[PDB]
Amino acid sequence: GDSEMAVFGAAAPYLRKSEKERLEAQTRPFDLKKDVFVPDDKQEFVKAKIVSREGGKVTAETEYGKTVTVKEDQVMQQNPPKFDKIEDMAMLTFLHEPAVLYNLKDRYGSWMIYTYSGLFCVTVNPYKWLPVYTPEVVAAYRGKKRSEAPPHIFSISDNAYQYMLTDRENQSILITGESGAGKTVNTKRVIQYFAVIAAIGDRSQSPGKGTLEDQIIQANPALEAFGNAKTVRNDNSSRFGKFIRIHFGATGKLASADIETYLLEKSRVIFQLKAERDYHIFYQILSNKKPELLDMLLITNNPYDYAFISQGETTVASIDDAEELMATDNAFDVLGFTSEEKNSMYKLTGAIMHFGNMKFKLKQREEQAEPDGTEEADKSAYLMGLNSADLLKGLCHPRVKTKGQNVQQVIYATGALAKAVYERMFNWMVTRINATLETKQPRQYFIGVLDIAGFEIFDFNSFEQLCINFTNEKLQQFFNHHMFVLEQEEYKKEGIEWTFIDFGMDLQACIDLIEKPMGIMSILEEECMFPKATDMTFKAKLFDNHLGKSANFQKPRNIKGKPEAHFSLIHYAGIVDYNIIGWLQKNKDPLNETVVGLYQKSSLKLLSTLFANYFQTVSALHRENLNKLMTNLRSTHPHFVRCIIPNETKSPGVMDNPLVMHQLRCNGVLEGIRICRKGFPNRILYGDFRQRYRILNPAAIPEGQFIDSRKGAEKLLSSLDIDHNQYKFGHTKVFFKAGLLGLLEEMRDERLSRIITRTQAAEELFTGVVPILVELDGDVNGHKFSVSGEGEGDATYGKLTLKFICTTGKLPVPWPTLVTTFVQCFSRYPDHMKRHDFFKSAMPEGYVQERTIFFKDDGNYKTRAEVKFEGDTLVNRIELKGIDFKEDGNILGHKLEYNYNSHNVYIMADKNGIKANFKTRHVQLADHYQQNTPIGNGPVLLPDNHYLSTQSALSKDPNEKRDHMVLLEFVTAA
Ligand SMILES: COC(=O)N1CCN(Cc2cccc(NC(=O)Nc3ccc(C)nc3)c2F)CC1
């Protein structure tokens, strides 16, 4: 309702449309039989309208106008309009891939970027400023359960906070997405929200300016200068994963915080694709906004003077590198870094710029490298606190147990050293930030925010992707297991006896293949400890150990125009081809240990600290960090946020179906649907079930007040031709397999469809004024008489007007005893009761109206009429037989008044017809026992218990010689 949305002010249209909008959208034309989804080559899925069918093929017209034919089993139902832009997609009737996709797309196209799907909060990058993050919207989300407000990431944050205070247990919020999907912005939103609402925070010996909240928030511009970069998909992309824990003490007050980082993209430091930059800090320093830095670093202000940082782009329209240097330098001040610490970091950064400018050439006629120039090597060693001759001597002639390098190797070696200094500098800075955020105030609970690259499949997938995907496999298993426990709780609460093996188990084989002994990483680790091992011997040890034995391990699918791969892995998100060139190298990450010896002895304390503790391979460390991350996550109640990148052109409002589909298959959303689908995903309250699927068998669910809805559903379902094992009865709901409710929904559309046909046929049979002929042949107490009637009928107004003439003299019985006997098909059924118009539905074949009228005093009429169309005219042909009538009685002795009273005709059903019962007052009592039955061996509408309200007006035509009756009757159903 609209008033509930008032509290959101200007944000409201971006969170939920008004009931006026929503009313319209849910009245749009829809045919469950024609409006479908079909697969599509270029778009994955598209809507389509079915045009024709034959031989188990379907022909349809795509929403793009393309004619297509497809196998019947490839056609999927659309959800009806009541479900348009639904806020939680777990409520959809049809919950297949295109239904999810098109709900997202519909919501996003109306500027609603947030959507729930079960546990998931789904966020679509808007590419546009939205007014939904104001203080007013913060206030309106405080303390609300998820269901009490529109979808929003504030809901996730506020609830995670309240769960911690209320349950006194750790919480985590897991945020994934592809690069550019908006993980980093969402992560900041969530942490800013904690800083706004968290209770402080009793005061007590720690570096930093401001409050802990200021410091937590300032860790961002600090880390982003060294860990973020202009990529093709995002001007400000994090190239590292991040887990931040915000700690609270025993009474719920903000206590401290710590950050862990993962998987910094080292390669970016010395290499860029054409449309990308290196990390921000290089261009920030180069902005000359703090000129003493250019002097301290022995550099110009031209990035193109530096090979490591100028292979792609060097300026970004959206980024003022000058302003950002101040933000970076300010952040290091707030976090309590000394000027020595700060400057030492700037120096190492300048040193790395120079490193990549050092040139080398070949000796006169040898294959040995020697320095070409020496200037840039000099500037570099100086900043690093090292001897320049020692540096260049280390590079060219390393010591083992000792020498030998060509130009290729030297160029390779300096590049690896640049990357290693930079990575270890990054870790150092994070540990220093952690030292500021450490307040030594007691901690009892935390809220962990994890922000890491999601599962991604590239054209070329190498060792780094394997690490990403392994992590995400472990994170998806974690979700599955959590989803399993909640499902069990739900089936238990409802008393449904169901179970299955833990959903997290489905991912165990993939995980074991990667992580157990003799698994892929174990082999890689074993192999790079062998000096003579090669990429080819590695390939072999994997195949020899797993091809044929581990089903998730497979031959590469070497597809189309995609680069060479060596094996393929079956992950939850799909099958991935891995290229294993260079993995022995990447895993052991060899460094020139002569030059590392110099770093260790540097006079610059920082550089010396960075290599102090210098065996461990990349994969062993990753395993260690992941295990530490998962132990933390498993101690929490988790919440999951999915970021979606809608398109590749930063365009607001528009979605590429395939891009979004890939993401949905990879990020857990479709996974979540699949595993709940193992059980009984569709759940319906007994009340809603009756008020929706009654029409399938109206007999088994009576009408009225106090109705036993569980019995109604148990009787109705038991009476259909369906797999009775595909539903179970809980305390308050019916649980359905997805296929079965989808069938009930098709059957309902079919039954509803037949009805609309039959009622339409039966109204265009009574459109216009309709001619009536009435014929009676009476026989009361042995005295025959005959009445004839002629008049006009008009069902639209529920009016009829007839003249009746006794064509055999004076009438043996009073005229008001023949009204009930003298065409209820002219009743006006309201525009909403029409399916209950039995009389019209029996036409033109007509119906038999048999009656038995017992009069109080006298005897009784036995009536049998046939009411059928007969040309363009409606004929009511009655035969009557009054018997055992008192000759002195108020009937036969013409005692009754010349008037009629209003009655209700109480209609029930039978089978193929109806039956009524009513008592007429004249004042003489008379009870009617009416039965109607069709005459055509064809379908008629049996109605729910209802009554006809009838009014009858007896008059005389003053000009009529013969004994007669003029009648006016007004009849309407209710
Ligand atoms: C991202 O995907 C996932 O994580 N999942 C989303 C969908 N899943 C399937 C599922 C499981 C449990 C209950 C429901 N449905 C619901 O509660 N009521 C309901 C109401 C009316 C009708 C026709 N069907 C059901 C349900 F869809 C739940 C997790």
Residue numbers in the entry: 2 to 205, 209 to 405, 412 to 624, 644 to 851, 855 to 943, 946 to 956, 963 to 1014
Q: How do the authors describe this structure?
A:
The lever arm α-helix projecting from the myosin MD is truncated within the IQ motif that forms the essential light-chain-binding site and joined to a short amino terminal α-helix of GFP. This corresponds to residues 1–787 of the human β-cardiac myosin fused to residues 5–238 of Aequorea victoria GFP.
The structure of the cardiac MD::GFP chimera (cMD) was determined to a resolution of 3.2 Å for the Apo and 2.25 Å for the OM+ crystals. The drug-free Apo cMD crystallized in space group P1, and with OM bound, the protein crystallized in space group P21. OM binding involves extensive interaction with at least six residues from the 25-K domain (A91, M92, L96, S118, G119 and F121), two from the relay helix (M493 and E497), four from the SH1 helix (V698, G701, I702 and C705) and four from the β-sheets of the converter domain (P710, N711, R712 and L770). There are four potential hydrogen-bonding interactions between the protein and drug that involve A91, M92, S118 and N711. The N711 H-bond to the OM methyl-pyridine ring is of interest because this residue is a serine in fast skeletal muscle myosin and is one of only three sequence differences in the binding cleft that might account for the selectivity of the drug for modulating the activity of cardiac myosin but not skeletal myosin. However, analysis of the protein–drug interface indicates that OM binding results in extensive solvent shielding of residues that couple the structural elements that are central to the conformation changes of the recovery stroke: the SH1 helix, the relay helix and the converter domain. For example, OM buries the only solvent-accessible surface of the E497-R712 salt bridge that links the relay helix to the converter domain, thereby fortifying the bond. Comparison of the Apo and OM+ structures reveals changes in the β-sheet that propagates out from the drug-binding cleft and results in a twist of the final three strands (β5, β6 and β7) of the sheet affecting the β-bulge and the HO-β5 loop, key elements of the Transducer region.
